[PDB]
């Protein structure tokens, strides 16, 4: 409900989607 | 000093939102971005339900709500990491937001006036340039299987 909570959750989901789509060479 | 460049970066991103989100022409011709826009349009089709669910219980049809989505883009790199997938996710999300505002001109125009700058900062201009910028992203989008 907090703006900070809203922003944190959306950002986390966006980063997770990005990370799943990413086709950069992964770390060892 | 990339001062001559920042206006053009924000404009290129706005043209992605115009092209992919609103299916409308942009102000200048960006040939390198043609395959990038096609790729984004494909992500939007194949992952529509995912993005619409991100905003399911978010009251974003307001200037404060649009702002919060821009702040959300900035926080994607909160963990200190950036990568091409996240960059594309940011650009796809901005395009979806424009699309969803397409019947609300004042809010649509607000989103096109602020989200490009948020996305520019969220991607990271130094990070992006060090990787060839739009030429790098065009190569990623053309050389690699989804």
Residue numbers in the entry:
A (entry chain B): 80 to 107
B (entry chain A): 1 to 146
Publication excerpt:
The KsBcl-2:Bid complex was refined to 1.41 Å, whereas the KsBcl-2:Puma complex was refined to 2.11 Å. Clear and continuous electron density was observed for KsBcl-2 residues 1–146 and Bid residues 79–104 in the KsBcl-2: Bid BH3 complex, as well as KsBcl-2 residues 1–146 and Puma residues 130–155 in the KsBcl-2: Puma BH3 complex. Binding of Bid BH3 peptide to KsBcl-2 occurs via the canonical ligand binding groove that is formed by helices α2–α5. The four canonical BH3 motif defining residues from Bid, I89, L93 and V96 and M100, are bound in four hydrophobic pockets of the ligand binding groove. A fifth hydrophobic pocket in KsBcl-2 is occupied by Bid I85. A comparison of overall fold of the KsBcl-2: Bid BH3 complex reveals that it is very similar to that observed in other Bcl-2: BH3 complexes.
Kaposi sarcoma herpes virus (KSHV), a member of the gammaherpesvirinae, has been shown to encode for KsBcl-2, a potent inhibitor of Bcl-2 mediated apoptosis. KsBcl-2 acts by directly engaging host pro-apoptotic Bcl-2 proteins including Bak, Bax and Bok, the BH3-only proteins; Bim, Bid, Bik, Hrk, Noxa and Puma. We also show KsBcl-2 adopts a globular conserved monomeric Bcl-2-fold structure similar to other characterized herpes virus encoded Bcl-2 homologs and binds BH3 motif peptides using the canonical Bcl-2 ligand binding groove. KsBcl-2 lacks any significant shared sequence identity with mammalian Bcl-2 proteins though it does contain a recognizable “NWGR” sequence motif in the BH1 region, which is crucial for pro-survival function of majority of Bcl-2 family proteins.
